C-alpha cells in the first residue's frame, strides 16, 4: 500500500512515494514551512517508520539525518529502500530500541548526540513512555555545546508521557506549536 505525500501550498517542495507495512505528515508539514528548524542541524529519528519526516529532513539540507526503528529486518530494509529512493552524504538507517545504551548507533553513524530528534506518532503505547524518554535523554545534544537543542514531538488526538518527562526533573516539556494532531518540544534544563 503505497501512500503518496507532498507538502502544502506556500512552503519554501516535492512529493513523496512511500511503501508501508499522521502525525508523520504534521511533523512534516512542519518541516517545509520552517525549514530552518533543521537546516544544516543533526537529526535523528525515532520509530522512523515508512521514512517519511527522515526523507522531508534529508531534502531540508540536514548534515545527517539518522533514521531509526526496531531491529526488525522487515521495516528496515523498506525503510531504506524508501529513504535511498528519494537521495541523489545520504541519511544512514540504523536500528535501535528504545532505552537502549546508542553505543552502537553512535558507532555506525559517528554522532554520539543530536541537535534536533524527531518524534513523529510514538505515543500510542504508554508502556513505552519511559524508554522513550530515556532515549531522547541519551540522544539529545547537551546544553553545554547545543543550547539549541531540541526534540519535536508530534501525535493524534495521555500528554501523560510530557507528564512523565517533566515528573522525571532532567528534560522538560512544553507545548510548541498550533494543532493541525498536535505538536509539541523536549528541551534540557
Not at 508501508?20 to 518541516?31: H, K, P, Q
Not at 530494509?77 to 552502537?104: C, F, M, Q
Not at 558507532?107 to 508502556?127: I, K
Not at 488526538?157 to 493541525?180: C, K, M, Q, T, Y
Amino acid at each position: 500500500r503505497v501512500e503518496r505525500y507532498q507538502s502544502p501550498a506556500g512552503a519554501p517542495q516535492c512529493s513523496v512515494q512511500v511503501q508501508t507495512t499522521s502525525g508523520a505528515r504534521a511533523l512534516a508539514d512542519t518541516l517545509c514551512w520552517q525549514p530552518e528548524l533543521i537546516a544544516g542541524k543533526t537529526v535523528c529519528e525515532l520509530g522512523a517508520g515508512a521514512g517519511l519526516v527522515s526523507i522531508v529532513a534529508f531534502l531540508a539540507g540536514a548534515d545527517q539525518v539518522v533514521a531509526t526503528d526496531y531491529p526488525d529486518p522487515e521495516i528496515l530494509n523498506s525503510l531504506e529502500s524508501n529513504i535511498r529512493e528519494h537521495t541523489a552524504a545520504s541519511p544512514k538507517v540504523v536500528p535501535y530500541r528504545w532505552g537502549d545504551s546508542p553505543d552502537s548507533l553512535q558507532r555506525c553513524t559517528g554522532l554520539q548526540r543530536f541537535q534536533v530528534v524527531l518524534l513523529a506518532d510514538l505515543l500510542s503505547f504508554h508502556q513505552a513512555h519511559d524508554a522513550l524518554l530515556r532515549s531522547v535523554k541519551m540522544l539529545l545534544a547537551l546544553p553545554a555545546n547545543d543550547p539549541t537543542a531540541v526534540a519535536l514531538v508530534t501525535f493524534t488526538h495521555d500528554l501523560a508521557f510530557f507528564r512523565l518527562v517533566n515528573a522525571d526533573g532532567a528534560l522538560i516539556a512544553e507545548p510548541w506549536l498550533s494543532p493541525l494532531v498536535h505538536r509539541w518540544r523536549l528541551r534540557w534544563r
